[PDB]
Design an enzyme around this catalytic site. Structure first.
Site, PDB file in Angstrom:
ATOM      1  N   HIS A 118      -3.161  -3.412   7.589  1.00 31.37           N
ATOM      2  CA  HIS A 118      -4.197  -3.666   6.586  1.00 31.37           C
ATOM      3  C   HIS A 118      -4.900  -2.372   6.164  1.00 31.37           C
ATOM      4  CE1 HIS A 118      -7.956  -5.297   4.854  1.00 31.37           C
ATOM      5  NE2 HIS A 118      -8.611  -4.590   5.760  1.00 31.37           N
ATOM      6  N   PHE A 119      -5.066  -2.177   4.859  1.00 32.98           N
ATOM      7  CA  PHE A 119      -5.757  -0.990   4.358  1.00 32.98           C
ATOM      8  C   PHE A 119      -7.224  -1.404   4.268  1.00 32.98           C
ATOM      9  CE2 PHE A 119      -7.425   2.057   1.332  1.00 32.98           C
ATOM     10  CZ  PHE A 119      -6.744   3.229   1.657  1.00 32.98           C
ATOM     11  N   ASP A 120      -8.074  -0.746   5.045  1.00 35.26           N
ATOM     12  CA  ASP A 120      -9.482  -1.108   5.090  1.00 35.26           C
ATOM     13  C   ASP A 120     -10.396  -0.383   4.112  1.00 35.26           C
ATOM     14  OD1 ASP A 120     -11.014  -3.105   6.527  1.00 35.26           O
ATOM     15  OD2 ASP A 120     -12.126  -1.448   7.452  1.00 35.26           O
ATOM     16  N   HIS A 139       0.734  -1.263   0.000  1.00 31.15           N
ATOM     17  CA  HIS A 139       0.000   0.000   0.000  1.00 31.15           C
ATOM     18  C   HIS A 139       0.762   1.311   0.000  1.00 31.15           C
ATOM     19  CE1 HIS A 139      -3.533  -2.477   0.444  1.00 31.15           C
ATOM     20  NE2 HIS A 139      -3.063  -2.999   1.562  1.00 31.15           N
ATOM     21  N   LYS A 192      -4.896  -9.508  -8.121  1.00 31.62           N
ATOM     22  CA  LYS A 192      -5.613  -8.984  -6.961  1.00 31.62           C
ATOM     23  C   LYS A 192      -6.664  -8.040  -7.531  1.00 31.62           C
ATOM     24  CE  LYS A 192      -4.982  -6.791  -2.433  1.00 31.62           C
ATOM     25  NZ  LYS A 192      -4.058  -6.078  -1.499  1.00 31.62           N
TER      26      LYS A 192
END
Length: 120
Positions: free
Chosen positions: A115-117, A12, A37
């Site tokens: 984690h990128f939410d 990210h 992805k």
């Protein structure tokens, strides 16, 4: 072994966006190895700025967990979305630039993004 924090940076972070950006980035960051992805987001702010989000606005994660944080100010990001004409191993993405607040899940000691939410 690659840590969760390191995995976040690889997947990210891009502090250094053309229509070719996502096609290049998604590949160079090894995000198109096992499969294309579906979607991914790259943040162009500094690592320090993104890491600082872990001490910002606490909000619920999409999965229902409580360790997510939203940035107080907007951030320069790029959304990468897989096209229809995209077929593995030739993954094709739609590069969309934007300035939005980001939401990341944080964990560990030091407490950093893992984690990128979402982007809102």
């Amino acid at each position: 072994k690659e840590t969760a924090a390191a995995k976040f940076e690889r997947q990210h972070m891009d502090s250094s966006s053309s229509s070719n950006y996502c096609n290049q980035m998604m590949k160079s960051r090894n995000l198109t190895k096992d499969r294309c992805k579906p979607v991914n987001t790259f943040v162009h702010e500094s690592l320090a700025d993104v890491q600082a989000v872990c001490s910002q606005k606490n909000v619920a994660c999409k999965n229902g967990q409580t360790n997510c944080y939203q940035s107080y100010s907007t951030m320069s990001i790029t959304d990468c979305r897989e096209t229809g004409s995209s077929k593995y191993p030739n993954c094709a993405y739609k590069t969309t630039q934007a300035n939005k607040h980001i939401i990341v899940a944080c964990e560990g000691n030091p407490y950093v993004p893992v984690h990128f939410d979402a982007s809102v």
